Enzyme design. Structure first.
Site, PDB file in Angstrom:
ATOM      1  N   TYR A  83      21.687 -18.242 -32.854  1.00 12.75           N
ATOM      2  CA  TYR A  83      20.886 -17.155 -32.633  1.00 12.75           C
ATOM      3  C   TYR A  83      19.934 -17.378 -31.737  1.00 12.75           C
ATOM      4  CZ  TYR A  83      17.287 -20.164 -34.731  1.00 12.75           C
ATOM      5  OH  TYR A  83      16.474 -21.223 -35.122  1.00 12.75           O
TER       6      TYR A  83
ATOM      7  N   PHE B  40      10.902 -16.673 -29.379  1.00  7.34           N
ATOM      8  CA  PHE B  40      10.514 -17.859 -29.997  1.00  7.34           C
ATOM      9  C   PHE B  40      11.388 -18.910 -30.365  1.00  7.34           C
ATOM     10  CE2 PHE B  40      11.014 -14.602 -33.145  1.00  7.34           C
ATOM     11  CZ  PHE B  40      11.900 -15.046 -34.207  1.00  7.34           C
ATOM     12  N   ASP B  41      12.810 -18.645 -30.399  1.00  6.04           N
ATOM     13  CA  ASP B  41      13.600 -19.908 -30.615  1.00  6.04           C
ATOM     14  C   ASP B  41      15.172 -19.489 -30.415  1.00  6.04           C
ATOM     15  OD1 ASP B  41      14.232 -22.530 -31.225  1.00  6.04           O
ATOM     16  OD2 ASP B  41      14.778 -21.664 -33.457  1.00  6.04           O
TER      17      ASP B  41
ATOM     18  N   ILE C 280      14.852 -15.329 -43.909  1.00  4.30           N
ATOM     19  CA  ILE C 280      14.060 -14.005 -44.018  1.00  4.30           C
ATOM     20  C   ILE C 280      15.175 -13.116 -44.781  1.00  4.30           C
ATOM     21  CG2 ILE C 280      12.452 -14.508 -42.439  1.00  4.30           C
ATOM     22  CD1 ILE C 280      13.977 -12.659 -40.546  1.00  4.30           C
TER      23      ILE C 280
ATOM     24  N   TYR D 169       8.644 -11.913 -42.090  1.00  6.87           N
ATOM     25  CA  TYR D 169       7.482 -12.659 -42.485  1.00  6.87           C
ATOM     26  C   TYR D 169       6.278 -11.912 -42.781  1.00  6.87           C
ATOM     27  CZ  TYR D 169      10.223 -16.418 -40.221  1.00  6.87           C
ATOM     28  OH  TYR D 169      11.439 -17.339 -39.642  1.00  6.87           O
TER      29      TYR D 169
ATOM     30  N   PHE E 123      16.600 -10.438 -33.292  1.00  7.17           N
ATOM     31  CA  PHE E 123      17.612 -11.624 -33.158  1.00  7.17           C
ATOM     32  C   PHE E 123      19.050 -11.086 -32.660  1.00  7.17           C
ATOM     33  CE2 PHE E 123      14.865 -12.469 -36.645  1.00  7.17           C
ATOM     34  CZ  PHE E 123      14.502 -13.698 -36.434  1.00  7.17           C
TER      35      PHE E 123
END
Length: 128
Positions: A45, A55-56, A75, A101, A118
């Site tokens: 992902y 962010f990642d 999540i 979140y 994502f």
């Protein structure tokens, strides 16, 4: 950009039809069927804020992310979204905070009340 594309064109895959998890299939999987709830799923992902801030990415470390589907280990949007995927599929997901979140966020990377994007590749899945 891809988040706006999902806002504009994505499928609402939530049971509440509250637009909380929106999906577009980007690459159709060769796999014919979805995983079952409880199955171990392996994904790659990339996760961004809705404004496009990355962010990642699991590709940064050649490390698929593994979880048990539908068990609340991730999540909500991921339990919901990956349950709709076939092996080999790549999708885009846009996730309202209620499915991510929430108000608390996950600082530093994820602010309060963040809608998250994502790109997810379902690499494989295995029995429980």
């Amino acid at each position: 950009g891809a988040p706006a594309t999902v806002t504009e064109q994505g499928e609402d895959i939530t049971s509440k039809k509250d637009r909380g998890v929106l999906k577009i299939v980007k690459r159709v999987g060769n796999g014919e069927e979805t995983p079952m709830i409880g199955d171990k799923v392996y994904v790659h992902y990339k996760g961004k804020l809705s404004n496009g801030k990355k962010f990642d990415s699991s590709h940064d470390r050649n490390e698929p992310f593994v979880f048990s589907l539908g068990k609340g280990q991730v999540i909500k949007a991921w339990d919901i979204g990956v349950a709709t995927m076939k092996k080999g599929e790549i999708c885009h997901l846009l996730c309202k905070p209620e499915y991510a979140y929430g108000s608390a966020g996950s600082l530093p990377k994820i602010p309060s009340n963040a809608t998250l994007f994502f790109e997810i590749e379902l690499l494989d899945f295995k029995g429980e």
